[PDB]
Design a protein around this ligand. Structure first.
Ligand SMILES: *[C@@H]1O[C@H](CO)[C@@H](O)[C@H](O)[C@H]1NC(C)=O
Ligand SMILES: *[C@@H]1O[C@H](CO)[C@@H](O)[C@H](O)[C@H]1NC(C)=O
Ligand SMILES: *[C@@H]1O[C@H](CO)[C@@H](O)[C@H](O)[C@H]1NC(C)=O
Ligand SMILES: *[C@H]1O[C@H](CO)[C@@H](O)[C@H](O)[C@H]1NC(C)=O
Length: 344
């Protein structure tokens, strides 16, 4: 079947089936220009049994790129432009078309915290302030909400959207945690006002939670309070990410990070999505326990590793990093086929 993704209990209902899901991150899927490369990648993700793919919903620039290069929005002090041409949001339209054909669902964030593909910094270049004043910078927020409308109105009645996501890893370093609570509240109310069919979430890493062991990710240095955020009425589920190598923690600390977040989601009466994770060293050994904790903890609705890697008919490989799990590799067998088989 094909219906809108909803929540039943503290699980997701995807095409009429209520139960845990596995998915993957494919930020780069959104920028593929050859339709055959979106088709082969989505064929592989679907035939692997994954149900949800997270793709970027942004590609922000301050200067127009070399002719032929993809860009979705040009941010300027004197008038910004949202690109709906063939080198713009039509590349994301094909990703949604292919998700519909392959019975896949998509999580789509609207801005990056980080400067990759522009991010908050491309708004600060156009509209002044800095990365923490961005949240209440009227000109930057007015353009951000114009871009949110331009993306949400294309797919608001498509059954292939799993959830809209306010941003990738929003932080407010050193800020009061109320700055992101009030921004997330207002912006998720706005997204609900444009689309009543789809779920909405924040896209944060889950930093700031007092039920942990006091490591830096549980403290409040990055402007986020997980328990305050998941209680926002217009956010339907919580997200959290996990990178012990970057965070200075050991890999086994990841299980308690999953458990504490899951319990905070369930205390708020909602599901959690373990939305990104990776280990740079020995990923099959170090990430498989995390997948089993997530599958077996009440409050979790699904998990998505960072990240899918694939290769195309002409012999080119996709973008990648040290966390890529290449389709058909031995790490794919360990972290994708074995995990889908455990779920069902
Ligand atoms: C960002 O701007 C605000 C307001 O001027 C200021 O209070 C804060 O210190 C600035 N951040 C940095 C890192 O300078
Ligand atoms: C599209 O979805 C909106 C709810 O977000 C609904 O009001 C509208 O009727 C739907 N459009 C069609 C053509 O069904
Ligand atoms: C994937 O592996 C199978 C062998 O297990 C092979 O039949 C198929 O051609 C491979 N797919 C790609 C895209 O290489
Ligand atoms: C590191 O993690 C915890 C501290 O959070 C410690 O008790 C545990 O023994 C260590 N585990 C490994 C395998 O390093």
């Amino acid at each position: 079947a094909s219906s809108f993704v909803t929540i039943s209990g503290t699980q997701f209902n995807i095409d009429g089936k209520v139960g845990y899901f596995a998915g993957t991150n494919c930020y780069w899927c959104s920028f593929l220009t050859n339709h055959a490369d979106v088709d082969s990648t989505f064929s592989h993700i679907s035939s692997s049994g994954l149900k949800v793919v997270r793709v970027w919903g942004f590609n922000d620039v301050n200067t127009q790129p070399s002719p032929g290069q993809i860009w979705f929005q040009k941010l300027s002090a004197t008038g910004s432009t949202i690109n709906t041409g063939a080198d713009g949001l039509q590349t994301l339209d094909y990703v949604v078309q292919s998700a519909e054909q392959h019975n896949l669902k998509l999580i789509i964030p609207f801005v990056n915290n980080w400067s990759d593909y522009g991010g908050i910094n491309a708004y600060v270049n156009a509209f002044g302030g800095n990365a923490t004043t961005w949240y209440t910078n009227t000109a930057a927020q007015t353009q951000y909400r114009k871009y949110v409308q331009a993306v949400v109105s294309r797919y608001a009645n498509s059954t292939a959207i799993f959830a809209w996501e306010l941003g990738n890893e929003p932080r407010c370093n050193g800020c009061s945690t109320d700055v992101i609570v009030q921004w997330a509240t207002s912006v998720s109310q706005y997204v609900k006002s444009l689309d009543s069919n789809h779920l909405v979430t924040l896209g944060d890493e889950g930093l700031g939670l007092s039920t942990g062991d006091g490591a830096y990710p549980y403290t409040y240095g990055e402007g986020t309070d997980f328990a305050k955020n998941v209680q926002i009425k217009s956010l339907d589920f919580g997200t959290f990410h996990l990178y012990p190598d970057s965070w200075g923690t050991n890999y086994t600390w990841g299980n308690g990070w999953i458990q504490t977040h899951a319990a905070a989601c369930l205390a708020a009466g909602k599901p959690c999505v373990f939305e990104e994770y990776g280990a740079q060293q020995n990923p099959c050994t170090n990430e498989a326990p995390w997948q089993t904790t997530s599958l077996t903890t009440r409050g979790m609705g699904g998990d998505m590793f960072w990240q899918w890697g694939d290769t195309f008919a002409n012999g080119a490989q996709s973008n990648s990093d040290p966390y890529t799990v290449w389709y058909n590799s031995s790490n794919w067998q360990c972290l994708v086929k074995n995990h889908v088989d455990a779920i069902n």
